Amino acid sequence: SIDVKYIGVKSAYVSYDVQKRTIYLNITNTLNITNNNYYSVEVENITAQVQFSKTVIGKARLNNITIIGPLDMKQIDYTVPTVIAEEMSYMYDFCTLISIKVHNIVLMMQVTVTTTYFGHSEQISQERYQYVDCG
Amino acid sequence: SIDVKYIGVKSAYVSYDVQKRTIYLNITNTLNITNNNYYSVEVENITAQVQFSKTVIGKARLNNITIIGPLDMKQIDYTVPTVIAEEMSYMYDFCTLISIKVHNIVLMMQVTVTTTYFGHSEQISQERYQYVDCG
Amino acid sequence: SIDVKYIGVKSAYVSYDVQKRTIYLNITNTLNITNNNYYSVEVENITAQVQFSKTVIGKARLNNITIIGPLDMKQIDYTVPTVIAEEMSYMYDFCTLISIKVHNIVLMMQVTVTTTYFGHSEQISQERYQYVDCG
């Protein structure tokens, strides 16, 4: 929700950082902070109802009948990697990768035939990544 | 929602950063901060109802009836990488990548046949990425 | 929700950091901080009802009836990696990776046929990653 911050080297509220081979003399330095946060987030107030069937069938006749709910047959992230060779050869090579399914992250939150949802859903990734270094 | 910031090297409210081989003399420095935040985000008030079926068939005759819910057969991120060779050969090479399915991040929130949703959904990614370095 | 911060090297409220071969003399330095946080997050008030079926069959006749609920037959992250060769050979090579299925992080929260949900769902990842280093 709030202040989802990525900071690569350094973070401060205040910084007086002094780096290499420097001379830093006779400084007078003062700081008078009021820093106040009244975070009232993600506050909720709910009256809810969820009803998948009401049925009245009285004096009826219902002879042949068939009923089926929601039907799911997805394929997701589906693969058939096929590598066919005869003289598959690797010789004297320095830095070599033969990579046929690789992931850093899979996040999945709600994967469903059905959902009813009255909430708050937050999904976050923060990262630094190198696949190869071989200098 | 609020303040989703990506910063490469440094972040500060105030900074007096002094770098390499510098001379920094006789400075007078004062600071009187008032910084207040009253974040009231993602606050909610809900009255809700969800229903999938109400039926009243009285005195009727239903001889041959068939009923089917929502039907899903999607293919998502589907692949058939086929490599066919004879004398597949790699020799003396320095930095070589054979990559057939590679993913950094896969984020999926709600993947569904049916959904009713009364909330707040957030999906965030913050990255620095290098696939190959071989200098 | 709040302050999902990724910091690579250093984090501070106030910093007076002095690095290599530097001289820091006769400094007068004061600090007067009032820093207050009143986090009132994720406060809730919920009244809810969930029902799957209500039925009244009176005087009815149900001779050949069939009923089926929600149906799931998904395939997710499904693979058939096939590598076929005759003289598969690796010789004198220095840094060789054969990778056929590799995952760093796999997070799945709710994978279901049906779900009703009245809460808060948060899924967070914070990382630094190198797949190969061989300089």
Q: Look up tokens 């957030």; give the residue.
A: B122
Residues C81-85: contacts with CB under 8 Å, at least 24 apart = C81/A79, C81/A81, C81/A100, C81/A101, C82/A80, C82/A81, C82/A82, C82/A83, C82/A84, C83/A83, C83/A100, C84/A82, C84/A83, C84/A84, C84/A85, C85/A84, C85/A85, C85/A86, C85/A87, C85/A88
Chain A: give the shortest CA distance to residue C38, in Å: 5
Rounded distance between C-alpha atoms, residue B15 and residue B11, angstroms: 9
Of C22, C38, C88, the CB nearest to A37: C38
Q: Which chains touch A (3 or more CB pairs under 8 A)?
A: B, C
Cβ contact, residue pair A120, B118, below 8 Å? no
* Strand, coil or helix: B16: coil
Strands (E), A46-120: 46-51, 54-56, 66-68, 71-72, 75-76, 82-84, 89-91, 95-99, 102-117
Cβ contact, residue pair A24, B29, below 8 Å? no
Rounded distance between C-alpha atoms, residue C14 and residue C4, angstroms: 20
Q: Which amino acid is at C57?
A: I
* Structural tokens at position B36: 């207040």
Rounded distance between C-alpha atoms, residue A121 and residue B123, angstroms: 8
Chain B: give the shortest CA distance to residue C63, in Å: 10
Cβ contact, residue pair B9, A8, below 8 Å? yes
How are beta strands A82-84 and C82-84 bridged, if at all? parallel
Q: Which amino acid is at A11?
A: S
Find chain B residues with C-beta within 8 A of A5's C-beta.
3-7, 11
* Maximum alpha-carbon separation in chain B: 99
Q: What share of chain C is helix, strand, coil (3-state, %, to 5)?
A: 0, 55, 45
* Structural tokens at position A37: 């946060």
* Structural tokens at position C54: 């209500």
**Bridge partners (DSSP) listed for residue B108:** A108
Question: Taking a C-beta distance cutoff of 8 angstroms, is the pair A5, B5 a contact?
Answer: yes
Find chain B residues with C-beta within 8 A of C4's C-beta.
124
Of A45, A69, A133, the CB nearest to C68: A69
| CA–CA distances in Å: residue B97 to residues A91, A92, B51 | 14, 15, 53
* Strand, coil or helix: C58: coil
Rounded distance between C-alpha atoms, residue C6 and residue A4, angstroms: 8
Question: Taking a C-beta distance cutoff of 8 angstroms, is the pair A85, B85 a contact?
Answer: yes
Burial of A90 (0-12, 13-18, 19+ CB in 10 A): buried
| Best residue in C71, C90, C102, C108 for a mutation probing chain B (most B CBs within 10 Å) | C71
**Nearby residues of B106 by Cβ (< 8 Å), 6 or more positions away:** A77, A103, A105, A106, A107, A108
Closest of C129, C134, B20 to residue A131, by C-alpha: C129
Count of A-B CB contacts under 8 Å = 511
Rounded distance between C-alpha atoms, residue B100 and residue B128, angstroms: 22
> What resolution in angstroms does the PDB record give?
3.5
Of C37, C60, C106, the CB nearest to A37: C37
Question: Taking a C-beta distance cutoff of 8 angstroms, is the pair A95, C133 a contact?
Answer: no
Rounded distance between C-alpha atoms, residue B36 and residue C85, angstroms: 68
| Cβ neighbour number for residue B111 with a 10 Å cutoff | 21
* Structural tokens at position C117: 């949900």
Per-position b or e across A11-45, b if 16+ CB within 10 A of its CB: bbbbbbbbbeebebeebebebebebebebbbbbbe
Question: Taking a C-beta distance cutoff of 8 angstroms, is the pair C13, A13 a contact?
Answer: yes
